[PDB]
Design an enzyme around this catalytic site. Structure first.
Site, PDB file in Angstrom:
ATOM      1  N   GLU A  21      -1.818   1.219   5.475  1.00  0.00           N
ATOM      2  CA  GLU A  21      -0.984   2.149   6.232  1.00  0.00           C
ATOM      3  C   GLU A  21      -1.663   2.579   7.527  1.00  0.00           C
ATOM      4  O   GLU A  21      -0.997   2.831   8.538  1.00  0.00           O
ATOM      5  CB  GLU A  21      -0.649   3.369   5.373  1.00  0.00           C
ATOM      6  CG  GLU A  21       0.550   3.185   4.457  1.00  0.00           C
ATOM      7  CD  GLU A  21       0.167   2.637   3.096  1.00  0.00           C
ATOM      8  OE1 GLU A  21      -1.020   2.306   2.898  1.00  0.00           O
ATOM      9  OE2 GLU A  21       1.056   2.543   2.224  1.00  0.00           O
ATOM     10  N   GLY A  63       2.691   0.279  -0.547  1.00  0.00           N
ATOM     11  CA  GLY A  63       3.505   0.841  -1.608  1.00  0.00           C
ATOM     12  C   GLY A  63       3.268   0.189  -2.954  1.00  0.00           C
ATOM     13  O   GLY A  63       3.469   0.820  -3.996  1.00  0.00           O
ATOM     14  N   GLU A  90       0.343   1.893  -4.700  1.00  0.00           N
ATOM     15  CA  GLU A  90       0.761   3.207  -5.179  1.00  0.00           C
ATOM     16  C   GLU A  90       1.639   3.091  -6.418  1.00  0.00           C
ATOM     17  O   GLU A  90       1.476   3.854  -7.378  1.00  0.00           O
ATOM     18  CB  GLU A  90       1.496   3.957  -4.066  1.00  0.00           C
ATOM     19  CG  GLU A  90       0.691   4.091  -2.783  1.00  0.00           C
ATOM     20  CD  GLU A  90       1.530   4.565  -1.613  1.00  0.00           C
ATOM     21  OE1 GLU A  90       2.597   3.966  -1.364  1.00  0.00           O
ATOM     22  OE2 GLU A  90       1.123   5.538  -0.944  1.00  0.00           O
ATOM     23  N   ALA A 129       6.403  -1.278   1.690  1.00  0.00           N
ATOM     24  CA  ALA A 129       7.787  -0.980   2.014  1.00  0.00           C
ATOM     25  C   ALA A 129       8.247  -1.766   3.239  1.00  0.00           C
ATOM     26  O   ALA A 129       7.447  -2.315   4.001  1.00  0.00           O
ATOM     27  CB  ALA A 129       7.970   0.517   2.262  1.00  0.00           C
TER      28      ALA A 129
END
Ligand SMILES: [Mg+2]
Ligand SMILES: [Mg+2]
Lengths: 260, 260, 260, 260, 260, 260
Positions: A134, A111, A114, A68
């Site tokens: 992250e 992201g 995921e 992101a």
């Protein structure tokens, strides 16, 4: 609609496969709010299309999705994150009834990993890499980067990838069970489209039933899962597609399905 | 402290890694009551150490831990097991909040395999072997040797190892998902220390939150697991380390974390 | 009784292994009502045999079981399938207390893969193939072909196999964790018999307790699973085989078990 | 927009309570598609209203909601119901974050009882009646009429109400746990508005966290529920409202909350 | 160890009941850290006492426990709660193996209701009141005030008590199922002691097994719960107290139990 | 067949209700092996009867069932109980597809209370009493006396009844949710027969689907429970009884169901 971050089109013969290609090569397909909105629009458009039976999600050859955008989420506090529910439109792929095949080429970090794991089938290239960085920026994966990853590859590998942020190769993801097939970089999209064509060639309702039965394995026990599978196998008998397929099997021929 | 069964010290630069090495080479690191008590004391000391962010648990080069002492448990009856809760201090490793990396060298049989599986990351040598020989002496593994093993390597391999007691190679545990990395015997400890240093370099609170989110994958459904992951990702925003890491990502530099 | 679809006999030295061999080579071992009835009869006969400790289930050299008969299930409706609980005798293998080793040689498609996955240990030949082609005839696997498969091999591979019906090699099943050992086509039965002999040599009651503890990993959480494992390890102390095995371990010798 | 089936307005002092009153008295508040769409629109409008802290859902004095329209669902088949997810907008009340108090007056049968049970607090009049007559028309409740009912009133009463379709008095629902307070018919709406004002007077974010913690009791085990409760109680400390409330408790006064 | 916040003594004939009486009447039995430490010390002392078979927990006649001290938690941040785990010693009552009967007289608010609900049996007086006023100070109950409460009294009443903080009478708690018996204020302690004597008169190990079986009802499904109950009923046969009780029942006499 | 412990006959007009009456008045309907065998025979006979839609299980006027025969299980060991599965034929009532209404009159102690709780609807007389006295003979209830009881009446009351063995009145079981209706001892059987006739008058397949949906509330979460309920409500559209009932509701008349 006219998209500026993604490219949506129908590929393959008979136009039964919807291709949603991320078109952010300078930002390594950074998952921004506009890109997510365009992706959701294309997803619902392909879901409301009777000719489309399967969707193929892919990005670039060198990067699938590098996570992101951080500049729009640095000045966010705890209240604006809890209330307002920050990454909520990030799970619209999990509500799609049609199968979505992820063609991961290049980097799938944060992201991106995921979003790939949220798909039913993941097709990775020869140079595809998966990671969860992250922990390097002081946060944790918050879109399934820990639940689905630990269930797929196991506790040890997922723990290492989450606490260290290190990358794993496509071969390691295939050996651990994260992906189901390794393909060359220049032919990954074509093989994913062929698999989506093989999927969409069957009955869409029976395919959705099978997808629900498979997804129920992570939400219920083995006994209740088997009971729901038995109930779905009983319910699939009320469709004309089951009788047509069994007729084509007994009297050997090609089964003509009408999605009913 | 004066330990007679284990060796506890801080390794790595800046002393951020706690090394707990079993020191019973002539007994193949038998898991006795005194050794378990010393291991728990060392774990508590390393947990109450602000300068320690990760723990590395290892044994000998030829044996990690070859199971508990059978002499201290043969005369035990059914009533004396249930009451005193036999083997109640054997699960203190699962209560630690900091990551524990298991450096398994040699034999990890019975209680050793369970203690290794209770760790977050398992590092095994080229000659490391895992087995559950409890079935050979008329008992079953009672410290997670069936629950975690079946969830890690699958139903078939776990059933075989439990009902037969046969040993599996490190490559088998790697391809099955029991371990995460194979390292040489002469360098396994140092690679585990480097991994623990990479882990401790991040924010300890965010690392603990990520560890909890990963561990929640075996206790809740996928939907509730994702909800808890979302809540933890939202709570991460209330820490100063999250803002520090995001700022260091925005303006490219090294993030200085203060565990808050 | 005299069987016409299967062959039931006791194999191995000491007659401790019950061999249930499907004997439908011209129909690729089609799972019909009579075959299932004979299989259940042989299973209960071997379960009521005190001299048998393990069962080996195998088929033919070129096909283990190529699915159920489609002719006796084409004219079935939703009400007839629901108000008669179709394929309700197909899960009698899951109620067996003694271990069942699946010696899968050749094709294991549809009901065959479901019957193999219900076994505790799966032994596959070099040329063994697994697939779920139910989607090709307009139905879904309804005997555990989705719940157990997704838990064993993962989400992606199981989704692909279910939605496409494609076959996977024995090496793919070994890498994904579906099977536990690859053996030659000429010796797979002998290896399965030797494994069942090694299993039956232990305490049958303790073996059943261990099998229950392993099976509980798919029906409960990790905490409750560990609690049930602790309770079973405590209850196993009330058996005479436990103290006999522990005495044989203390004073090195061969443990004589009496299944009590 | 201008509603034709419902009436939406803000009631009570400070205008912090949103009143959604069904306005179909001649059809006993039949749950049709337009009424459900208007209810969802009003719920979204009240959710996007910062001045509203709680919602009160009520109907008529003689009937709350007497179920859905059977004419719009008689000619429906299995495929049309499954491949369109019939009654999918009926669960938008469970996605609401602010508390919704159901003021049930008169008949709450089938869909009405389900919509009432989906609310957090149920306020019923002295003449209120609850039932599930779906079994009388050849169907079953499909909007939570069995799951929530059995969890609230127990197995026996839910089984009776479902298999017989008989109505229960408000006193029966109170003694069984379905409702929490019995109020006169002429003052039920006012008491519900006062309760919602008492709810809206607190911090909206802490109230939503408490609502989530309470709702999590039906989604996982007690241990994971307590863990999530501890995590939410810890996250509450990151808000200014908790500090303000504790300070107002220390120095006795009225706590001024700003929903952050 | 002399206590300053609680009073610990053995009551009843044969001295088989341990009475832990809170002795903070001026602060309405505020749950402070010192009081919690003394309570845990008394609990572990009574558990390690062979003569004690049941524990009775009570406070004052006008107040059982009015919640924790807010001054201790006023200057606490989010990081200080999480890291350090605030209120972590509050759940030592859930780890007690012997039954704990709560004699709630007067106010049981906040932490008091949570401590009472953690007991196996709750005995309330005529004027006993239960509430969860955490929402009034800007926080949520964080010691089981939502999980156990919603499971006991239902969704509606628990939601009301949590979001409003209103009090309920002992009669409402008995009707909803929060308590099991209502006693006069001057005789509540005596009836609780008599019940604890009736409990302790049985076999302590069988009583602990029954307590575990009952507590498992909130941690597993009905099928796995019944399976664990069957395993525990089988395991209770290996004790001498079971045979002694069966002998006393067949040959009518008084059973003499020896806790084995 | 000719029964010596029970009485089986079809009662009510149209002969749609099967009455299984225990006929051991001098032994207070002791649950022996022969009684359970005859009960299972009558249950399967009534299940294989197309004219029977519901079953009513009752005992005597002064005793429903006072538990299992004690002398039948005095000389049983742990191994004889585990390996033979003691009390296994006791849960055949849980596998019945048609509803079973328990008309409990008099004493329902031990196994009787468990057999009553295993039924879907429980009808108790004015003088009916429920208790679990297993704790008095040194054992625990092992046929659902703890799992179902704690879920029905709550934690506190079930804990008290299990640890003390005390009896509860029919009014207590009614207010706690254990039973659904209190009736005189002279008309309880007639009222249960009328309730079963009201149940048997509906569609048998839809009634079975509703019973399954209700029973699934104790085996899954709220979300998965609602999903299975939605799937069953979709599947019920594929039955002829649904369209017939909906047509009879649209054009007001009596619905003629054919159980298909
Ligand atoms: Mg794997
Ligand atoms: Mg109740």
């Amino acid at each position: 609609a006219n998209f500026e971050y993604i490219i949506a089109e129908k590929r393959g013969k008979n136009n039964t496969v919807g291709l949603i290609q991320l078109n952010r090569p300078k930002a390594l397909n950074a998952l921004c709010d506009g890109l997510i909105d365009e992706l959701n629009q294309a997803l619902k458009t392909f879901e409301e299309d009777p000719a489309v039976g399967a969707i193929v999600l892919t990005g670039g050859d060198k990067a699938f999705a590098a996570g992101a955008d951080i500049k729009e989420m640095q000045n966010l506090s705890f209240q604006d994150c809890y209330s307002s529910k920050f990454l909520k439109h990030w799970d619209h792929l999990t509500q799609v009834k049609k199968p979505v095949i992820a063609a991961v080429n290049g980097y799938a970090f944060g992201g991106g990993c995921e979003l790939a794991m949220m798909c039913d089938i993941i097709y990775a290239g020869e140079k595809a890499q998966f990671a969860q960085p992250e922990i390097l920026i002081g946060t944790i994966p918050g879109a399934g980067g820990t639940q689905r990853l630990t269930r797929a590859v196991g506790k040890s590998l997922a723990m290492e990838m989450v606490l260290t942020g290190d990358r794993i190769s496509a071969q390691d993801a295939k050996q651990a069970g994260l992906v189901s097939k390794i393909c060359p970089v220049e032919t990954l999209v074509e093989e994913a489209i062929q698999c989506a064509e093989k999927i969409a060639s069957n009955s869409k309702i029976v395919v959705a039933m099978a997808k629900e039965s498979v997804n129920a394995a992570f939400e219920m026990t083995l006994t209740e899962g088997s009971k729901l599978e038995k109930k779905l196998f009983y319910s699939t008998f009320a469709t004309d597609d089951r009788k047509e397929g069994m007729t084509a099997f007994v009297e050997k021929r090609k089964a003509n399905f009408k999605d009913q």
